[PDB]
């Protein structure tokens, strides 16, 4: 069996990708590019793609877990939020593609213990003012859930004691004020 079966993961996931085009609504500007479940079939896709270091100023990558739209709106985003990464201008060259990669290994991996079923998926973004990456869970209010994440992915991204990271809530988002650090 195992010399010829892939590696199932423990969720399906789809890969989205968004492009700023300002002749259209952001929600159009947003476009599933493909699903995986298998180890196998992730570097298959990932080694197909461009590193987000690479893509044009005002486009995003997304991971979200099957079945959940990478959008405030859907219902399993509409009471969540998202631990925010900001990196700054020069982490783009030093940071971003790295951190990127072990964040999309820390939801397919489910490395968050028994909260990562608090786990949406996540985004980065491509910006030129500074780029960001964040990991989006379903309740801003399971503190426990919401903290523990934070504090696994801040040291899954081997980020010092002397950084911080907030968890900031969609509905704050949507209207900044972070409501945990870690």
Not at 14 to 28: E, G
Not at 118 to 140: L, S
Not at 153 to 180: C, M, W
Request: with cysteine.
């Amino acid at each position: 069996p195992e010399h010829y079966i892939k590696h199932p993961l423990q969720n399906r996931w789809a890969l989205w990708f968004f492009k700023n085009d300002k002749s259209k609504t952001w929600q159009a500007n947003l476009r599933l590019i493909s699903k995986f479940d298998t180890v196998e079939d992730f570097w298959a896709l990932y080694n197909h793609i461009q590193l987000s270091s690479n893509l044009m100023p005002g486009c995003d990558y997304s991971l979200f877990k099957d079945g959940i739209e990478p959008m405030w709106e859907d219902e399993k985003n509409k009471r969540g939020g998202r631990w925010l990464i900001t990196l700054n201008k020069q982490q783009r060259r030093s940071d971003l593609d790295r951190f990127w990669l072990e964040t999309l290994l820390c939801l397919i991996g489910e490395s968050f213990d028994d909260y990562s079923d608090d786990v949406c998926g996540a985004v980065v973004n491509v910006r030129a003012k500074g780029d960001k990456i964040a990991i989006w869970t379903t309740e801003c209010e399971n503190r426990d859930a919401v903290t523990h994440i934070g504090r696994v992915y801040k040291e899954r991204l081997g980020l010092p004691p002397k950084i911080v990271i907030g968890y900031q809530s969609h509905a704050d988002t949507a209207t900044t004020k972070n409501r945990f650090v870690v």
